[PDB]
Amino acid sequence: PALSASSRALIDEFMSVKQTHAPIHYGHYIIEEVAPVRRILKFGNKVVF
Amino acid sequence: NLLLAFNLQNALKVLCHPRLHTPAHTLNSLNAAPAPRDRRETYSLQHRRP
Amino acid sequence: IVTPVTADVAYFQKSNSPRGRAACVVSCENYNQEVAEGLIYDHSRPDAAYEYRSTVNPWASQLGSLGDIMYNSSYRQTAVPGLYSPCRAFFNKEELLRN
């Protein structure tokens, strides 16, 4: 599964706190990506692995 | 790391091809099935003429 | 450069071009005149970055747009004003195909 969401809000929360991000909000939903390649993301200066 | 979007407009190039809208392939598959349904149904199949 | 208010802010956190369409310097074509001009001006295709829309503003990414009118003339050293506009490096049609 690739990294997907239902809003920009959950994406910009996923970069905020990786260990405490809410995978399921009220109606929206976000999927953290598991993959053989652990691709790195840059949204300004906050980064996750 | 570009935040792309996937709305229905990108889906429109697949959800509007008539191959997705024809039942001829799935009915050709189901009629050519070696073991069809065990039970059938009779009520409200078609419209009967008064 | 003047823009609509509906250009998303998620466009601007990346290092994108100040006009709409990201001018692919060689990823259009090497030595052609209708693919570079195609992938710079003609909005019939979306740009290489964001395939879900053609431009992020139609007041600068078009050929006859405001961002081409008030900025892109041919740069001359002997211009009588002679001031430097920093956004002229993104709009010069000669410089956009100088690479």
C10/A44 CB distance under 8 A = no
- Distance, CA of B49 to chain centre: 29
Rounded distance, CA C73 to CA C69, Å?
Answer: 8
Rounded distance, CA B7 to CA A7, Å?
Answer: 11
Q: Which residues of B touch A42 (CB under 8 A)?
A: 1
- Using alpha carbons only, give the angle C18, A10, A49 rounded to the nearest 5 degrees: 80
CB within 8 Å of A21: residues ≥ 6 apart: A10, A13, A14, A30, A32
- Using alpha carbons, select from A34, A32, A35, A39 the residue that is nearest to residue A18: A32
Chain C interface, Cβ < 8 Å to B: 10, 14, 49-52
Give the tokens for residue B45: 């199949």
Q: Which residues pair with A24 in a beta bridge?
A: A29
Instruction: Determine the residue of chain A that is closest to C8 in CA distance.
Output: A8
Outline where chain A has alpha helix (H): 8-14
